[PDB]
Design a protein around this nucleic acid. Sequence first.
RNA 1: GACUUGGGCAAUGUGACUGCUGAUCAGCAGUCACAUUGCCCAAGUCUCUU
Length: 49
Amino acid sequence: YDDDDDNVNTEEVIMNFSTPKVQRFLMSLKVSFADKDPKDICCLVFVER
RNA sequence: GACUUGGGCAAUGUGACUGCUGAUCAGCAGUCACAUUGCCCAAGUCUCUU
């Protein structure tokens, strides 16, 4: 209820309802693919389960 | 003991694709008969001609 912009709400909860692992993961995403060519980027995410 | 991956054996189905039969419909072709009025040649009968 501090902010009502659903974009800002989603970003805030993704930033603060999440472990530092996911925070750093998404930060690597944003610093890697901020505004690059969508055709240029082609990446894999490997997880356990 | 969780976690992950892969494979195999099952059954219960679905989605379609062709093959055959029948029916329906659209789509083309080859004809044939035959009234009507015309045209050009062949041979006939007759007026006239003679």
